[PDB]
Paper text:
To generalize this engineering approach for crystal contacts, a non-ADH-homologous enzyme was selected to apply the established strategies to the Nostoc sp. PCC 1720 ene reductase (NostocER). This oxidoreductase from the old yellow enzyme family (OYE, EC 1.6.99.1) catalyzes the trans-hydrogenations of activated alkenes, demonstrating its industrial relevance as a biocatalyst. As OYEs are strongly dependent on cost-intensive NADPH as a cofactor, Mähler et al. engineered NADH-accepting variants (NostocER1) by exchanging NostocER loop regions at cofactor-binding sites to ER loop regions from Achromobacter sp. JA81 and Acaryochloris marina with a higher NADH affinity. For this study, the NostocER1 Loop1,5 variant (NostocER1-L1,5) was selected as an example protein for the rational introduction of Lys–Glu interactions at crystal contacts to demonstrate the impact of rational single amino acid exchanges on the crystallizability of proteins and enhance protein crystallization.
Out of the nine tested NspER1-L1,5 mutants produced in E. coli, six crystallized, while four mutants revealed an increased propensity to crystallize in static µL-batch crystallization compared to the wild type: Q204K, Q350K, D352K, and T354K. The best-performing mutant Q204K was selected for upscaling, crystallizing faster than the wild type in a stirred batch crystallizer. In addition, crystallization of 3.75 g L−1 Q204K revealed an extended nucleation window toward lower protein concentrations for this mutant. Out of these seven, three mutants (43%) crystallized significantly better than the NspER1-L1,5 WT, as demonstrated by five different parameters defined for enhanced crystallizability (see Section 1): Q204K (5/5), D352K (2/5), and T354K (2/5). It is noteworthy that the nucleation window of Q204K (compared to the WT) not only extended to reduced protein and crystallization agent concentrations, but also to different buffers. After crystallization initiation (addition of the crystallization buffer to the protein solution), the protein concentration of mutant Q204K declined and dropped to 1.1 g L−1 within five hours. Subsequently, the protein concentration of mutant Q204K decreased significantly slower, and the equilibrium was reached at 0.4 g L−1 within 19.5 h with a crystal yield of 91.7%. Crystallization of NspER1-L1,5 mutant Q204K was successfully performed with up to 35% (w/v) HCP in static µL-batch experiments, whereas the WT did not crystallize. Mutants Q204K and Q350K crystallized in space group P212121, with the RMSD of the crystalline environment in this crystal packing indicating structural differences. The crystal contact at positions Q204K and Q350K both reveal an approximation of the intermolecular partners E89 (5.3 Å) and E27 (7.8 Å), respectively, compared to the WT.
Author numbering: 14 to 370
């Protein structure tokens, strides 16, 4: 009888429970986009998680899309992250870094030399983007040259190697939520005619090349991949998600990864006519550990673990507001309510001051 509190062997790591802290952008980086002691407190408070996945962290300057998100490209950023991984480990936890490149979800004001954001195809996102001068229309991104794709892969590889020097236990590739890798995956955002567009094998090529590079830095059992098959976030949608994401799930098996992590969009059932990509399809296709996420509770999480539908369950919103979420779930305690107005930016309030039981 396994449940949310059962231990799990994740490669060489013993996880004390099946509860994962999902990656959560909090936009509280310091000067130079460097993590600092307040960030270390925040993650240290949550070290009872079976595994923490740290917030999306840009692997290279062009991969930033929102003010004040941390990076993992500079020595100062490695040193600030070391504060965080030191604290997590002192508190008996385990933490992977989520490696990010936003692709077209950015603005020139956030890019080096005021350049265009890069993408598979020159398609401006709809709406507005936050900059250091407030909100502005998105611009049309530049479509990467075929010859530039090795440089993207190398930026992810270096980001991964910097994460290893920062003392993380592993890394998660952010291939979800309409960021650069997802922009290549999905046919709504990828109109390319080279070997990185068209057929699914081509649209998955960036993800597979990034994963191969990262597994040359980390033991593969310390490398995870996140997908979000039915999100519509950031204007990024695929016309045949079952075929696209089922293919990806199988194609990742060669790498013997730590896990596949599925963010199950909250509106999937009500949007369209029903869920077009049952997570069970991906569970059957991917031969390793599966993390599921999206609206979980004690009762939903226990159910998926008991019936072999997933191995780990990640919680986002509840970990914002409940630093001791595992303890609270275990004893059916009250749960603190998350305050969205302090999700992003700021200081201790809405970050490290949510109370423990
Ligand atoms: C404030 C906030 C920030 C987020 N930042 C990230 C991120 O950095 N990386 C990511 O992959 N997902 C991110 N997400 C999505 C969450 O990881 C999670 O998948 C989503 O909130 C659904 O899970 P939940 O219902 O348990 O909150 C974020 C969500 C929230 C609420």
């Amino acid at each position: 009888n396994i449940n949310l509190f059962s231990s799990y062997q994740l490669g060489e790591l013993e996880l004390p429970n099946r509860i994962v802290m999902a990656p959560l952008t909090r936009s509280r980086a310091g000067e130079g986009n460097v993590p600092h002691q307040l960030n270390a407190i925040y993650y240290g408070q949550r070290a009872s998680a079976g595994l923490i996945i740290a917030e999306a962290t840009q692997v290279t300057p062009q991969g930033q899309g929102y003010p004040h998100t941390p990076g993992i490209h500079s020595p100062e950023q490695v040193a600030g992250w070391k504060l965080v991984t030191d604290t997590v480990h002192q508190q008996g936890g385990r933490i992977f870094l989520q490696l990010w490149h936003v692709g077209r979800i950015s603005h020139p004001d956030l890019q080096p030399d005021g350049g265009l954001p890069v993408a598979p195809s020159a398609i401006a996102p709809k709406g507005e983007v936050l900059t250091y001068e407030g909100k502005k229309p998105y611009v049309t991104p530049r479509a990467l040259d075929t010859s530039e794709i090795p440089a993207i892969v190398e930026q992810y590889r270096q980001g991964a190697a910097n994460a290893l020097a920062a003392g993380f236990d592993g890394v998660e590739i952010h291939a979800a939520n309409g960021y650069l890798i997802d922009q290549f995956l999905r046919d709504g955002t990828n109109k390319r005619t080279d070997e990185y567009g068209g057929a699914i094998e081509n649209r998955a090529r960036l993800l597979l090349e990034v994963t191969e590079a990262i597994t040359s830095v980390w033991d593969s059992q310390r490398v995870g991949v996140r997908l979000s098959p039915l999100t519509t976030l950031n204007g990024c949608v695929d016309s045949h998600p079952l075929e696209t994401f089922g293919y990806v799930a199988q194609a990742l098996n060669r790498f013997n990864l730590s896990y596949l992590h599925i963010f199950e969009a909250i509106d999937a059932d009500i949007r369209h006519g029903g869920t077009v990509v049952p997570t069970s399809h991906l569970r059957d296709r991917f031969t390793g550990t599966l993390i599921v996420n999206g609206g979980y509770t004690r009762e939903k999480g226990d159910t998926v673990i008991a019936n072999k539908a997933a191995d780990l369950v990640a919680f986002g919103t509840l970990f914002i507001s409940n630093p001791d979420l595992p303890e609270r779930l275990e004893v059916n305690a009250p749960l603190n309510q998350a305050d969205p107005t302090t999700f992003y930016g700021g200081g201790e309030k809405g970050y490290t001051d949510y109370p423990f039981l």
